[PDB]
Every structure is written in C-alpha cells, then in structure tokens.
Symmetry: D2
Subunit: 508 residues, 4 copies
Amino acid sequence: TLLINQPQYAWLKELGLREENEGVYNGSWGGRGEVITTYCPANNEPIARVRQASVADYEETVKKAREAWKIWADIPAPKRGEIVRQIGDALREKIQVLGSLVSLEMGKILVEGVGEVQEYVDICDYAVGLSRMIGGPILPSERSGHALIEQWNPVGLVGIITAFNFPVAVYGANNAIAMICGNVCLWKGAPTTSLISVAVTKIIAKVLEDNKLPGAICSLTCGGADIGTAMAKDERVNLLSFTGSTQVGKQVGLMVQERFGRSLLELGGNNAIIAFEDADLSLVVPSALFAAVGTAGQRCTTARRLFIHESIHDEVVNRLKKAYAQIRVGNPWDPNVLYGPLHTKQAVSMFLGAVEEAKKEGGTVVYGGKVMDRPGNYVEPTIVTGLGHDASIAHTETFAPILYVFKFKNEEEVFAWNNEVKQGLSSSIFTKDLGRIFRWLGPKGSDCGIVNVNIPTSGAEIGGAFGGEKHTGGGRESGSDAWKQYMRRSTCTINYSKDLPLAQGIKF
Amino acid sequence: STLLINQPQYAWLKELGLREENEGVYNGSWGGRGEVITTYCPANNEPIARVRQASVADYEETVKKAREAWKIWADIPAPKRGEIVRQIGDALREKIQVLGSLVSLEMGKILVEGVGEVQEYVDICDYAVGLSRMIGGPILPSERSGHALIEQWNPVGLVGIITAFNFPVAVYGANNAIAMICGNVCLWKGAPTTSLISVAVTKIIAKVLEDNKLPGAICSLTCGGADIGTAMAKDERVNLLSFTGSTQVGKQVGLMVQERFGRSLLELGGNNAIIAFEDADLSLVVPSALFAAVGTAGQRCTTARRLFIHESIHDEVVNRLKKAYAQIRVGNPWDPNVLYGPLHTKQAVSMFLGAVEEAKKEGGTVVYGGKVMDRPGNYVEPTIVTGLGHDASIAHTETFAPILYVFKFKNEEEVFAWNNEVKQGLSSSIFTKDLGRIFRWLGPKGSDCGIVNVNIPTSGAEIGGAFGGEKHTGGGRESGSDAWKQYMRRSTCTINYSKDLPLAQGIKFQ
Amino acid sequence: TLLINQPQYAWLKELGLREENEGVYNGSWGGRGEVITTYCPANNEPIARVRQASVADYEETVKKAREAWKIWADIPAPKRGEIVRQIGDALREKIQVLGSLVSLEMGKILVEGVGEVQEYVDICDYAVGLSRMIGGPILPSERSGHALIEQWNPVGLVGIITAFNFPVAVYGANNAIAMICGNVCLWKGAPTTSLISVAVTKIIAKVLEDNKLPGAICSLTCGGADIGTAMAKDERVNLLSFTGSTQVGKQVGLMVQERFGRSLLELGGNNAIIAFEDADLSLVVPSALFAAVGTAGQRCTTARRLFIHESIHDEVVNRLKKAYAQIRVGNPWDPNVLYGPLHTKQAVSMFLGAVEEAKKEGGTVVYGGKVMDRPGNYVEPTIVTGLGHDASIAHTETFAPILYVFKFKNEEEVFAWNNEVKQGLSSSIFTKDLGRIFRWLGPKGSDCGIVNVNIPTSGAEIGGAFGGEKHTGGGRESGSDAWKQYMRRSTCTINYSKDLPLAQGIKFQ
Amino acid sequence: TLLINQPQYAWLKELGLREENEGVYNGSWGGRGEVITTYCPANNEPIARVRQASVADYEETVKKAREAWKIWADIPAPKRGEIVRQIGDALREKIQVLGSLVSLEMGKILVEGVGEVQEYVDICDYAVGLSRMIGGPILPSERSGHALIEQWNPVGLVGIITAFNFPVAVYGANNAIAMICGNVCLWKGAPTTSLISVAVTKIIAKVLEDNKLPGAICSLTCGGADIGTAMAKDERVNLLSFTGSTQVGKQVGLMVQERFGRSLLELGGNNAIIAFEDADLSLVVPSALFAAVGTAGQRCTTARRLFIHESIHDEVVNRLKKAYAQIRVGNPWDPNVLYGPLHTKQAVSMFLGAVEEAKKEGGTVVYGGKVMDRPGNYVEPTIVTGLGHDASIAHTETFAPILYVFKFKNEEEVFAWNNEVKQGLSSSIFTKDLGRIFRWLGPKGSDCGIVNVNIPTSGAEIGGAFGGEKHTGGGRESGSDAWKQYMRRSTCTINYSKDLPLAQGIKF
Ligand SMILES: O=C(O)c1ccccn1
C-alpha cells in the first residue's frame, strides 16, 4: 500500500525513513499534531506518513532552540564552519538517494533532484570559507585615542519557511549561512514535502549529535499555515526567512513588521526572456525550452514571458514548437525523462483554468494546453501567442508550464514591458549588441534582482546573492554579502584615552 | 514688528533668503497652496516667520517633477553626481554660522550644536564625494566557462525623506548626500515646527542645482504635516522612504510601505543606557553622562536616559553629577557659551512635568531639578531621579525631556540584560577598564543596540560608520560604511559570452 | 633675457615665482646646490632659475620630514583628509595659471596642462573620502575569547621621484594618497620641470602653514641623479615611489631591495592599439590619433604600436594620414593648438635616429619623419608601415611621436604580439565581438596593467589603480586599494580571556 | 640500516615511500641529479633516499608546467576550488602518517607534525570559499557609456621554495591559494626534508590524476641551491615565493628584481615578548615557554627576546626556570613528549657558540645551556639573563632554543627596543592597559607584521595574512587578501557607446 512498504522503493530506508515518521526535531524527535500522508505526484500513491507539530510542540521547540543558541553563539565562527563542512560531507554521502526522494515526493526529474542536493553541498563549502571571513571594517576615527569598528553578531533564532518546489536547496542556503553566522534555525517546510524535510533534518541531527552539540541548533517543526503564522508573529523568531507565494509572503512581511522583527522574503516571479533581432537563435530556442519547461514550469525563476522581435517571432515560435514536441514525458526518476508531473492536483486545476482564461482573453494555444490522460498530475507544456503584453492572465503568476509569447520592435518599449509587472525576480535578454547589454545592466535597464545576458532566467550559481525586487520581496540568499541579513551590525567606538573630544569638534 | 524676522536684531535671518512669508514647496519652482504655518522661537515664545505648506495638488505635482528629473539625473555618472554634492558641501561651509544660528533660533539647541549639526552634513558631503568613485559590486568568478558574473548596483528612483524636529538639518543631509551620489532624486518633508530650517536648507541646495543647469526637483521639498507623510508612505512612486521620528508613527509607516512592497529605512526612538562599572574612570563618567543627558536639553534620539552605576560608586557619581548639573550656564541658545537651552515646545514642558510626577508616583526621588525654570521660553531644569527599579514604567518611556533615571547594579551579566530589556535598541555605552568585559560587551552576549560604545557617551556619532538601531528603533542605517546600499537595488548578472550554454550545478538537460 | 622678466609672462608671479627660486623646502626655503636654468621648449628661451639641493640640504630635509612625521602620524586620518581637501581647493584656485606653467616649461598644450592639474584636484577629492575609510577587516578568530584584526599604519617617509612628462599629476596622486595614509613626503622632480615642482610646493606649503602644520610634511629637494640615487639608498626613505625610465627604474628597484625597503615602480610602456575587422572605424581613427600624438607622443601610455586587421589596414592607414595632416601645430599655450614641441633638444635627436633606424630595418615612412623648420623642438608626428611585429626599433621605447603600424589576421596571434614586449603598461582593442572582448579581459588576453576596449591607451580616470606589469615595474597609483602600498599591514590577535587556546588545536602541555 | 627497510617503520609505505624515491614530478616521476640520503635527527640514522633534479629535469619540468597552465587557467575558479577541496580531503586521510613523517624526518613532536598538516587542511577549506570570491570591484566611470572594472588573472607559474622547519604547511599555504587563483606551481623544498616533499607531492598527484588534470599543475623538483638559484633567475617563474634565511632571501629578491619578476619573501624573525607590570603572570609564563621552546626553538616566529618590567623580572624568571625544568624531552614520536632534537648537528654547533658568546658578553645562563648526552641533536632549552637589550649575541638569529631576558622600565623605550632589530615578523605584549594596547597596535607601536596582545609570538591562524616587515621581506601568505600576490591586476575601461569623452574633460 504505502510505497515505503514496497521493495521497488526500499532505498527510502537508507534515509532512515519508515512508515510513520516524527516531524518535530529539537534534539528529541516527536510530533503531537495531525499525521499527514504525502503522495507521489507521478502516480498519486501514498509514500509514508509524518507526525506534524502541535502548537505545544512548536512552543517547546522555540524554547529549546533559544537555549541551544547560548552554547552555539559561543562557538568561534571557524569552528561553526567545521560543523557545516561535516553537514556538506553527510549530504555527499546520501546525494543519490536524497535526490531520488526529491524526485519521488516533489516530482522533479532525477538530475534536478540530485542537482538541488549539490546546490546545498556547494553552499556548505562556500560557508566554510565565509566562516573565516565574516565581519566588518576597522575604520579611522576622526578622534584621537579612539577606535571605530563595525561588528557583526548573530540575530539569534532564524525561522526558515520553505516551499514545495525547492524542498532541499532553499533551506540549505538559509541554514548553512545562518549557522556560520552563529544563529540557530527552526524549519517549517511545505507539508507536501514533509518526508524530504525529515530526511534532511535526520542528516543534520546526526552531525550535531556526533559533535555533542544540542540538536535544537537545527530544529524542525513540520506543519501547515498555523505553524507558519505562529512563526511570523513570534517575537522570539529574530529573523524569518520566507520563501513562498507573493500573497502569503505579503502577510508574513506585515506580521513581522508589526512586531519590529526582521524578515527575508523570497516571493514569486513573472520572468521574461527577450530575443532581439541579432540574437543567436541556436542559443535562444533551447534556452527558452529549458527555462520554460524545466521543473514542469514550477520554478520561481521559470521563464513565463517570451518577447521576440517582430522579424524573428514566427521563426522562433515554429522552432520552439518542434522542440516541445520532442520533450520526453514520464516518471521523474526514470533516467530518460525530461518532464515529470506537476506537484499537486490543485496545480493541474489552476493550469487548466489559466489556459482557458488565456483563450478568453484572446490568446491562441499554439502548443499543448491539455491535461494529460494518465495517473498523476501531468499536463502538457504550453505556448500561448497573440495576447497583449498587459493581458491580465499574463501578469498573473500561475505555477504551471504556460509560456506567453509577445512581439516587440524597439528596445525601449520591451525594457519597459519587462519591468511593468509587479514581480521582480529574474530577467534575460539575448543579443550581441554591446551597447544594449550594458543598458540592460544599467539604471534604465531591467529592474529585477537577476539580470542575465544570453542565458535563461533560471539556474543561478551560489557565488552571487539570490533574490528579487518589488513583489518578489527584497530578500537575498547565498552569496556575496547576503550573510549580513542573518546578523546585526553594530557601530562601535572605543575611547582608550584619558580625554573626551566630541565628534564634529563640538566644544561642550 | 511681532515677527522676529521683522526685528533688526534678527536681520541675519535674511542672509538665508528667508522673508516674512516663505514658499514651502520646491520642485524646480517655489510654491505652496496649502496651509500657512507660523513657526515660533522656543527661547522666547515669539513668532519668527511663516511658511506656506504643500497642498495635495502640490505633492502630486512635485512627485511627478522629481520622477521626470530622475530620468536626467540617473544618466549622470556617479563621479559627476559627486561633484554636485561637493558643491553642496561648499555651500554649507559658506553659510555654516548663520545656518547653525537659525537651527538655534527655530529648534532651540545651543550654537555649538547647531553649527555642529551643519558640520555633520558637510562631513557627509565630503564622504559621499569619494564614495561617488567607489559604489558598486564585485566581479565574481563564475563556475561556468565563458561566462562573467557581476554584481551591479543601480538607483531605486525617488527617495522620500521624512525628518523630525530635533535634527532638522543633519538627518536630511545624511540621507540626501548619499541618495544623490547613488543616482536617486529626493523628496523632503520636515517637521512643521522647523519649516524655516527646511526652506533655508533647500534654498542652499536649489541654487547649486540651478547653477549647474540641473532640474531642481532632484532635491524636492514639500513642507507639511502628517497628511503629507502618510501620502509618501502610501505612494508607490516613492521607491524608498527614509523616516526619522517617533516609534509609534514609524511603525505605521513601515506597515504602509510593506503593504505596497516598497522599501523603508526606519530611524525611531532610543532609550539609551550608560553603564559605569566599579573600575571606571569617574573623570570620564561624569562629563560623559552630563553631555549625553543634558546635551540638546535631552531631546536627542541618542540622549542617555538610563544611568546604571555599580553599587560601590553610585552615591559618589550621583553627587558629582549633581554638582556638575548646577554649573550649567543657561540662556538663549544662539548666544555663544550658553550650554543649556529650552525644550522645543510648550507641550514638551508639560510632558516634562508629567514624567517627573509619574516618576514620583512610581517611587523615585528627584535629587536634582524637576521644575520648570522661572524665565521666558520653554525652559526646564535638567533632572536626576534615583530609587526606581530598572523595570519601572516611567523608565520604559521615551520622553524628549532632560530626565535621567539612575539605577544601581552589582553584576555584569544582569546589567547587560537590563541594557537589552527595553524595546528600543539605538545606542549604549559602558565605562570600564576591563579588557574582557569590553570585548564581551561588543560580542554576541553583549549590547543588542546599533551603537555600542566604550568610555564615551551614547550621543554624538561621527559620520564614517553606519548610524541606526535595532529592535523598535526600526533597523535602518544612514551615513557611513555600506549604508549606501539601502539607496540602491542589487542585481546579480550572468553574461554568457560563449557559443555554449552549460547549466549551474552541472545539470544536463538534453 | 629670462621669460619671467618679460611683461607677457608676468602671470608667472601669481605662482610666487621669481628670477631665481629656492628649490629646497622643508618648512623653510633654501638650496645650496647647483643653480639650474629651465627653458621653454617652444622657443628654447630661458624661463627662470632654481637653486637645487646640496647633500647637506638633503640630509637636513630628510631629518626634518621624519621629525614632522611624529606630529603628522598622530593626526586622525579624517583630519589629514581635511588638509588634502584644502590642497584640492588651493589647486582649483590656481588651475589656469598652473596649467600655463606646465605648458611653458614642459610643453604640452594648455588643455592637457589644465587637465593634468584637474587629475590632482580629482584625486584630492577621492582621498578625502578615503581618509574616512582606510583600514582592514575584523576577522573571526578560531579561538574563543580572542579578537583578530587587520591594522594598517603609515610606513613613514615616502620619497617621490617623478618625470618630465607629467610634472604635476604623478606627484599629486602619490601625495594625496600618502598624506591621508599618515606619511610625510619628499619630492624630487625632473630637473627640466623644476619651476613646476617649486610652484606646486609653494601651493602645498601655504596650506600646511595656514593649518599650523610643519611644512616638512611635504618636503621638496630639487636635484638630478645624485639626489635620486641618495633616495634609493637611504634607509630613512621607507617607500620610494619612482616614475621614470625602465633603465633607471631597474637600478632604483635593486638599490631599494638591497636595503629591504619598499619601492613603487612606474616605468615605461610600449602600448598597442588593436583594430579588428568589425571595429567602428569612426572610433578607431580619432582614438588612434589622440593616443599617438597627444602630448607629442611623450606619455608613458602613448600608443606606439597599431595593429590593424588585414582587411581594413589600408583604409585605416589612409584615414589616419588624412587625420594627421589636419593637426594644428603651434605654441602650446595658444588657442586650438593640438600639437606642441618635444620636451628637449636631445629628444629631437632621438626622434631622428629612430626614424633612420626604422628605414634601415625595412620600414616605410608614410607620413612625417622630419624635424619642422621652426623655433623650438618641433618634429612631425610620424607613421611607419611595413615593419614586422618583432622589428628591433618597434620593441624599443622611444619618447617620440612615431607610430608603428602592423597587419594581423587572427585574434590569438595578435593578442600574443601585444604581450610579446618587455613592457606591460597599457593596451586597447577595438571590436564589437562580445566573446573577443571577454577573452581580451581574461587569462589568455592582455597581460597589461591597463586593458581597454573601444578607447585609446592613454587618459585614465582616477577611480582605478594605475600602473603596469613586467618591465613597467608593478606599482600602482591613485585608485582602488593602491593606498595599501603606502602603509604596513599587521595581523593582530588579542586575547581578552583568561585562557590560551593554541592555533590548529595544538595541545602543548 | 635504512629505517624504511626496518619493519618497525613499515608505516612509511602508506605514503608511497620506498628505499629510493623519485624527487622530480611533472606528471611523471623521475630524477637524474644526485641521490640524497636524509637522516632522522633524533638518532642520526638514515631513513631513505631521494633522486634529486638535474638541470635537465628542471628545464623539462618548467616547460611541462607552463603547458599545463594553458589548460588549468581555462578551468573556472570554483572548479579549481573543487580540486583543492579534494586535496584537503586527501590530506585528512593521511594526516597521522604524514604527521609522523614530519616528526621522523624533520624532528618536531607529533602533535605539531599533525597540527602542521592541519594548517594545510584548513587553508584548503579557506581557499575553496575564496575560489567563489576572488576578483575586483566594478567601479562607476566618470564617462557616460563606459564601464570600469578591476580584473584579476593568474600570473602563470608560481615557484615555491620552502625551508626545513615547516616542510608541509608553508608549501600548502602557497599551493592552495596559488591553485584557486589559476596558477601552476613548482616546489623546491629543503634537501633535508626531501622525503616529506615527495610524500606531499604523491598525495596531490593522485588527486590531479583522478581528476584527469595534468600533474605538472603541482610540479616538484627536489634539489639544493643550484635549483633554487635557477628558479630565482628564470623568467618563466612569474612569481617566486621564498621562505628561508634572510641572507639567502635578500639575494633571491635581488635576482628576481633584476628580471622584473615577482617575489614573495618570508624570512627570519627576532621576535619579542614584553610583559608589563600589570600583566597576568599566569598567562605570561606558559606563553613564554611555548613560544620559546616550541619546535625546539626552530620557528621563524619563535620568541627569542623576553622583556620583563623591572618590578616582576625576578619572579617571572624564577617561575620560568621552575617550568623549563618540567619540559619533557624524548623522541618526537614518543607519547607525552614536549621537546625533540634540533634538525641538524650544525644547529647544535650554532647553539653552543651562541651560549658561549652570551656568557662572554656578560650573560648568566639561569637554565640549560648544554648539549644533552644522548643520540641525536638534542640541546637543553636555555634562558639567559643579564644582557643589555643591544647585546651583540641577542641580535643574531640563532635557530635554537635560547631565550634572552631583559629588563625595562617604561613603555616608550621597550616599544623602541622591540623595533630596533633588523627583522620584523612577530611581537607580543602582555598587559591589561587599554591605552597601552591600542598604542601598541597603532603607528607608534610594534613595527612587525604580527602584533599580538596576551598571546605569544607564534601559532597564528590561517584567516589572516601571515608575514613580516623590514628584513623579514614583506611577503604575506594565507588569509585576508594575500591571494592578490598570486594574480595580476588590470584596470579595464569598456566603451559601449559611439562617443569618445576623454578623462578629466580634455577636449582635443
Ligand atoms: O549620534 C547622534 O547623536 C546622532 C548622529 C546622527 C544624526 C542625529 N544624532
């Protein structure tokens, strides 16, 4: 009955999962909330069960995490990095089976499930180096006998709320950075990826316990919106990193602002690719396909708007069509598959509604647009032509593989059309024009947090800060100085003299 | 005759271009179709001059003109924008004494502090000029052959700036100089009771812009009250809103800006503590506490309001503080060598009396001061209260009045906790010679504030570092370090200059 | 017969100059060495005289500079920055008359003279900001109870030797940066630009004295090779910044290394411009003209090699010839003059020798190649085609306006030819190809300190670090973190605890 | 008679060592130069033999390294970091046996041998993070339509000459950083630690080979002064990093400067500890012992001068004497051993000469001063009192455990006494005075590259740049932005417009 109780899936026990799993970890495993069953999206069969957090579970866990912080903040940052390095090795030891679980419970293809674990592994290695580097400048005081220094210290407890579509890597990016910065973490993942959240936490818990560290340093409280909301309102959650829908994210942002907390918001995108007349069409067509259909269109960075110069529009559309027809559909863990199911049946319903609404707004389905007749949550990847750039359905983010195609003529209007949506995550132009590229990157260019040239909207690397502007929420994760969001800055002046000169020469 | 600006002894006000009635809207053009306000001298309760504030149409027209000017301003390279800011710096230098005198007249702080406040603006202009050659991000090594990876920084657009009465020049200036070199345009709304100062500052800046053939709306002014501030917080065209003011109002500003996914920079109240350990140099403690507590008549966000003294030295420090308080020269604040001026409004005087009375109700002892002074203007005695518990309600209330609550302590850990227990988190100071204690105060179990000082008072930051607080102080930073990043938007940019398309994390998709 | 005594040169007195000028400043003005007369290269007439430094002058000045350092290093960097700001203002007030002196004594046209002073003004502005910023990171120690910080402190006395061709801005860039970093300076300029060194030193001296600072913070000892050799051997000169010829610079570098001092070497260039087949020729032709004939070809960053793709070589050469013919020649202070004299008579002999050797090596002089028949050191700007890329004359740096033009076909061979010389100062390519640009900026591209795209090889802005690789000497000036060359780094670990955790977990007890 | 042929030392074969080993590696192993035998300094028995490089070997190896660079420089820096990370893992796998070999062939005790490999491991970790970080700023050009960027690129071939006393960690610090910066390396170690050089090179060669990279990326040419001099004069060695004697390093710097190459010089120190009257004597005494007798006084950072305030001089000396007596002498692999032999018999001769000269200069040997009666190069750790601060013998760098102890009265004079020597590496004060600590760190304080408070002169951590000033030569290794010495800076202006504005507004 349960897939975990079948021999074809026995590899699941290599992650320590069983028929019913505790979904609270705070140094002890438990869970007194409702028992959830998660299902495989490729065939709608139940996998295994997870005991979620009650409100009392949440309360005790927050309290144990903050107690653990007293020990953890006293550990020198490079020694904290050593813990994160060992997390990276423990992920390496299980990268194949953990990525297989991502494919089974979430539904993305195996190379992407494994790639998502690799992302976590890479940010661990990055964080280990950062743990010898984080800090601020010593600055020259205008005052004799005074030192001026910028200090950075952990904020305390970092709550981390993640979404279904990257159930490993977003948590990992938040976790590795927050840890070397001296914070403790509390994780609430998507309820429909509870087994993944448990498996990752099992890997981390062993590293902590092997090092005789309190496990609440990386706490887990599986649950739904009630846990998410409690975290948003909890003054003891010093920083709340939220990855999820723009609609829920706005309310998270407001609840955290109400209590003068700190939030890091990673919200939706409505990302555009723009192909100018001089673009390399050998580069445009596969870039569009990967960015539109990768992860069955379920990335925040998924290419949802394709603008093509009038001269090459019909040619690119025809070529994209013949390439969609060759997409290989099947079970996401089957090794010769490019395209798996959507994550939920609700997502199929939303996809179907968006398609029919695109038809009612005057669009033409030139490829796809049908729910597939097969077990699971499969839909056809879809191309829609003929809508105006400001069509209501086009300015809506639908987490589904629907690509809206538009004509354009001049650079100035199409830069404006890129920027006219409420979201601001990723953006790509394809062109060879040197001038046009630097204008794209400049103040009158793209307004997004990711601004790419001759590569698609998705698949960034960990060395840079990841996030967006406008309704994408403003937060950054991973690289550059994103670590600063997980710490508090102090500006510190130390008088080591016997005099008291005042700034600006004030003679009191 | 009744207006100060029409008396010959205050004729120096006209060196700032101020007249009997002044336009309070600037956007390239001077206007003001809203209410006319009269601002008053707190040292003698006489009216100074009038300002015609912004109507709603004025605000609407100014936002549009600023955003039009941004199209031109954003195309000027940063170093050339720095040259404009450098010229603003020179303009303030040439007016520093008479502008500081106006700050003393309309706001009420003493002359060395009014001049010192203009000096901060001059300092931040100098800083921003060098920064205009420096702002940007790293070129990073991509993991992909044939790709570049670069972090770009670009202006957010229109920066709205809302300021308070108690620093009517320096807070605007720190926001303005940094926002300008970062390629933003600005829209200023100051405290209505310091409207002449806002007008005078904007006349200085507008001349530099116009002399450089630039659209004046780059540094716009819309004088007005809470309805204008509320419009700025609700306006999607205001890309970043920097708000300095009360915690209560700032919380509502932050919520409104978050409601529209705007950006906000919040600089709210403090309840700042000085802590003197038993080993402290008392010859640094007593003068430092005096300046931090009675400076600006106790009306700074960074004013010391809580003084923790080790039990072994509590009585002696209190006695020496009392003797120091009695020495303070009181007078008109624009008079050189005056050390103590009036509170900004009559209401503040009443709230001073209110807090003193509540402090007595809660069991405290007024060991010095506590009364209004018998003279013209809004003068109160700088006041010292002993005997309250550290958790007394009146001691957890920011009041822009010169009242210092003094507490005893014994142990390091408890007094760090008492520093951290309040809702605000702006500034903090310990006085001690102990090396370990100092690094613990600066560390993760030490002060939770944005300013963490050792052997100096809570007030008087230099411009080279970032300025701001944590917790209910709102989290914004101004001035130094990389505070400039709050005025720009980061983008992480990958440029494929090859003929292949390898994907991150080595993912194969064919 | 001195120019300074003629009515039309009376503006020289606005710089405090007179008939015979003291060439030593250390708080007081002096000079007991040989008196030198400098001459205007536009008419070979004498301008004025400078009393140079004796050994006793040099000895007394080094001692005074190091005594002043005790005061100067105690002044907070932002307060030092305020001094540099006032130097910037005193330069702005005299920019026209100082530019004019640069034109008269050095010989570059007035816009470049004024523009060189502007460089110094610009870097003052930059340094004022830097004075609030210089320092190092606080780093996380692996040891509990320990702080780990990087401190930066001045080296002490910075000796600065400069050349004739940029007699203001190279000193200025070293000066502003060394000053905000807490160092005192000792200047020895080119003897043929002694009046410019004196006039600059007078402007700075007034600012120091006006601020009640000891004037030896910016000391001057005008002299020849004897003073520069003394500086290179002097253990009291903590950093020697030397701008000049590769030959002299190599010996300076050795002498400083012999005594374990620090040196900043800014030496010669043999800079190439490369025009690919896809280049905007409306960009190539004016860019090549400016880089090759600007300052009469006497910049270290002057373009001396021009690589043009085979397809466009003849078209570019003809357009450049037509462009050379339209250059306006005359007195460099006269309006709209774009080309003035070479700096010395010796430079004119070198110009002629290089051209003869060019034809000997098989070259073809397609334009110029002769001295002009007029007073001063005027030579025709010259274009030579037909040499191989590795001809001897083309690998030698001659401070004369001679442009060597080469054909190429493929990108990899021409990148290599850029890199094949001993110098490594500046380089430039003209192209629209996005991949070619990033390869030129990458590890298999240009090996130079300055690597440009669609602009010539000369005229840098101050925001970045300036200098070259290979025989150019490795030093950097002005922008980015060039300031670190003027300071010493310390790595400082502070135990504030009551324990002694050892690094790498070594248990030794 | 060879220890490697005794079954007692069979653990050496875990490092791939044999009776006769190849001392040249460039992807293949060889060596046509003289065969050197290295000896164990604790018993003067021969360990094994190494075939050193002939000049022909060196020429062949330089050429192969330069060709390998063309491949290596094209590998993206993060992927170069992945190679270094694997090098770090390969060292972890052999840390005990490699640490034992350091103790056997060099002579330091086992916790320090192991700890020296740990330095290398830690710098690999650090460099892995750096590999995603190295580069320069994008700057705002004053010219419209222009970009201004600071690029950093590899210099090419980095020659690395190391010394006997840290035969692993110094090479490692140079190697890990140079690798991620895109350089190839050529290593010439101390002839008397040739077996250590081969063993480290064997570990790195396996990683390179497993990753299908040319082995000459980390070349080795074992040899003496002829190889070292060829490297210093070789224009193909773009950067030469030299750790060693001040006398030899001066000639290396001159030879490199003659050819306009780059050199990084890490030379000797004459390092001082200063104990003020308010110092915690419980910190002072152990720190002085570890810093003075650690590694039998053979570190470049060894404490050789101890300045004690007059009021506490006698009590500190007496307490140090009572402590030196409890130093445990034995073989450097025997357990609980604090103190081993000197590296050579010549070092013993220099030791006796220095003790004899110190006595003739008026010093009193208050502890030690004599050769130990046992096999190997053992000498007693020695304390000398009574000398003036400028005594001739105290201003020699004798690489042996002799601590010269001086009195002082005032801060200004003893700071000057710290600074009066020719070397400028490490320095340390013990005090509680805030004002004195910040003066020591400031412009009138220590003139050294390492400036410590309440910790001794040795044992620095990898996060900061390591090196000294004055006759210590000025190079830096390891942390902060020391990576910049291994790369070349370029300032790059890109005109993406159709206009030609000149800098400073010059109209031509
Ligand atoms: O530290 C202070 O008192 C603060 C500084 C910035 C402007 C307002 N006042």
